[PDB]
Amino acid sequence: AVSKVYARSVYDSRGNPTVEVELTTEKGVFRSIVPSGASTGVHEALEMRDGDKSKWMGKGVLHAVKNVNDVIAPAFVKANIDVKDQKAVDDFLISLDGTANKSKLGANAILGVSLAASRAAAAEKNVPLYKHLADLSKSKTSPYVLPVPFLNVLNGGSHAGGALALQEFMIAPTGAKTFAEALRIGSEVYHNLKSLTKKRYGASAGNVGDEGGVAPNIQTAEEALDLIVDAIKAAGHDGKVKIGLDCASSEFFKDGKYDLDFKNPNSDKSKWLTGPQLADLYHSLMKRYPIVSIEDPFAEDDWEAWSHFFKTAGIQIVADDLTVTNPKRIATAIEKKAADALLLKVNQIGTLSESIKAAQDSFAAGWGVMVSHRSGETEDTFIADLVVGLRTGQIKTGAPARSERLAKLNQLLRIEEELGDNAVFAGENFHHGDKL
């Protein structure tokens, strides 16, 4: 039984406060921490901020913390809920807020309670978190599937100062035989990239963005891609490493057009692209580089653009801001054949139950699912256990630099070790890892 529910303010990877929750049971104290995005889709569940410009630059979470402590806590403990019953847990929480967007208590007040209960339940059951998550999701566990890590080695958009519009340039070692191998390979590529980047664009170019990737000040995707393929080759991994993109196009969508100079306050409107024009740009990239996944190619409500591009795209198309880990939205995307992959962010929806449903619905439609961190991460490692539980075969949790990234990557090495032969590595089967 839950004897205490408590929250506190802690700091994220960027130096902004976030919510940390602890749940106490007869099994101990279970702690979960809420992540925070930067390029947040307009449809995400509410992240409650204090908005007091005089403290934390207006980003405190005292209100959210207070909602946990003064609203949720006593009520939750009184309720005497069965932590093992995730659904019951989330039902209680959702009910307590009573809003569609969790704007009453805030998504960042709900989430940590949701996640912490799951940790508690795993403890009650005496099983590892990933196994409990496979249980809650009714996922197959024989064998378990370890994900290919999509490492964001070169950062742009809203994640790094510089002119580069596209947000993320990831490498995925789909050719590795094990997760450990993939991580080694990814780290080697990363070091080579850092060195080539300083050489080609200047010492400052090697300094990092929010997600740990290098941050050269360049105007085009080709300049980033060229560096990456060069790094793969220098590292000796040609053919084992593929590329993924996160366009985060909503960040540059204005006036029905797409601004690839969006970070320039005086950007030339005459240069903004139409949806078709942008699609042609992407096709150029696809034909040239070993890109196997493109995320958020069009804006979060630009349905027609997505559907149109989708019929011509011969690779994984990931929905992020389009879907916001929301089953309702996913259903729209599925019917419209807008994408074939969901980017899963527990904090975009606010509860673990909802997130799991999002995953299930996606898998039911033949889509893939890439579990993801936020640009504002913490020392929390939930998502590592989550992507294994969910059997997705793919995760994005950063470059192999900045510990809020490595913490998940390290957790995955521990999981692998623990499972041994009871797990396979998704490798080239990443898209449908759940069906392995």
Ligand X SMILES: *O[C](*)C(*)(*)(*)(O(*)(*)P(*)(*)(*)(*)(O*)(O*)=O*)C(*)(*)(*)(O*)=O*
Say whether residue 374 binds ligand X (CB under 6 A): yes
The two three-digit tokens of residue 95, written as one number: 């009910």
Are the C-beta atoms of 334 and 367 separated by less than 8 Å?
Answer: yes
**Cα–Cα nearest to 156, from 143, 165, 147, 148:** 165
Question: Is 435 an active-site residue?
Answer: no
Q: Please return the burial class of 124, using the count of CB atoms within 10 Å of its CB with bins 0-12, 13-18 and 19+.
A: middle
The one of Mg ion, ligand X, its own copies, none whose footprint includes residue 374, by CB under 5 to 8 A per kind, is ligand X
Min dist. Cβ of residue 160 to its own copies (A):
6
Footprint on residues 290-349 left by its own copies (CB under 8 A): none
Given the residues 345, 354, 377, 416, the one annotated as active site: 345
Using DSSP bridges, classify how beta strands 242-246 and 291-295 pair: parallel, antiparallel or unpaired: parallel
Residues 233-261 as b/e (b if ≥16 CB within 10 A, e otherwise) read ebbebeebbbbbbbbbbbbbbeeebbbbb
Footprint on residues 90-119 left by ligand X (CB under 6 A): none
- Amino acid identity of residue 366, one-letter, is G
Are the C-beta atoms of 260 and 284 separated by less than 8 Å?
Answer: no
Question: Total residues contacting its own copies (rule CB under 8 A)?
Answer: 56
**DSSP-derived 3-state class of residue 206:** helix
Are the C-beta atoms of 18 and 376 separated by less than 8 Å?
Answer: yes
Min dist. Cβ of residue 252 to its own copies (A):
15
Min dist. Cβ of residue 295 to Mg ion (A):
5
Are the C-beta atoms of 352 and 86 separated by less than 8 Å?
Answer: yes
Report whether 168 belongs to an annotated binding site.
Answer: yes
Min dist. Cβ of residue 227 to Mg ion (A):
21
Report whether 43 belongs to an annotated binding site.
Answer: no
Task: Convert residues 198-217 into a mask of x (bound to its own copies by CB under 8 A) and - (unbound).
Answer: x---xxxxxxxx--x--x-x
Judged by CB under 5 A, which of 25, 32, 39, 249 binds Mg ion? 39
Say whether residue 417 binds its own copies (CB under 8 A): yes
Say whether residue 429 binds ligand X (CB under 6 A): no
Say whether residue 108 binds Mg ion (CB under 5 A): no
Cis peptide before 143 (omega within 30 of 0): yes
Report whether 246 belongs to an annotated binding site.
Answer: yes
Given the residues 20, 44, 188, 211, the one annotated as active site: 211
The two three-digit tokens of residue 404, written as one number: 């809020």
Min dist. Cβ of residue 39 to Mg ion (A):
3
Say whether residue 59 binds ligand X (CB under 6 A): no
Report whether 63 belongs to an annotated binding site.
Answer: no
The one of ligand X, Mg ion, its own copies, none whose footprint includes residue 10, by CB under 5 to 8 A per kind, is its own copies
Footprint on residues 239-278 left by its own copies (CB under 8 A): 263
Residue closer to Mg ion (CB basis): 114 or 250: 250
CA distances in angstroms from 107 to 44, 73, 325, listed in the order given: 9, 15, 13
The two three-digit tokens of residue 375, written as one number: 């640009």
Question: Is 345 an active-site residue?
Answer: yes
The one of ligand X, Mg ion, its own copies, none whose footprint includes residue 191, by CB under 5 to 8 A per kind, is its own copies
Provide the 10 A C-beta neighbour count for residue 57.
Answer: 12
Q: Which stretch binds its own copies (CB under 8 A): 53-61, 106-114, 275-283, 285-293?
A: 53-61
Residue closer to its own copies (CB basis): 34 or 322: 34
Provide the 10 A C-beta neighbour count for residue 380.
Answer: 23
**Cα–Cα nearest to 149, from 417, 349, 411:** 411
**Cα–Cα nearest to 19, from 123, 138, 109, 152:** 109
Report whether 295 belongs to an annotated binding site.
Answer: yes
Residue closer to its own copies (CB basis): 8 or 63: 8
Report whether 396 belongs to an annotated binding site.
Answer: yes
- Residue 413 and residue 404: Cα distance in Å, rounded? 15
- Residue 93 and residue 351: Cα distance in Å, rounded? 9
Say whether residue 152 binds Mg ion (CB under 5 A): no
Are the C-beta atoms of 358 and 344 separated by less than 8 Å?
Answer: yes
Report whether 50 belongs to an annotated binding site.
Answer: no
- Residue 434 and residue 143: Cα distance in Å, rounded? 11
Are the C-beta atoms of 394 and 372 separated by less than 8 Å?
Answer: no
Judged by CB under 8 A, which of 27, 84, 125, 191 binds its own copies? 191
Binding site for its own copies (CB under 8 A): 8-17, 20, 54-57, 160-163, 183-184, 187-188, 190-191, 198, 202-209, 212, 215, 217, 236, 263, 377-379, 399-407, 409-410, 413-414, 417
Annotated binding-site residues for Mg(2+) read 246, 295, 320
- Residues classed as catalytic: 211, 345
Binding-site sequence positions? 159, 168, 246, 295, 320, 372-375, 396
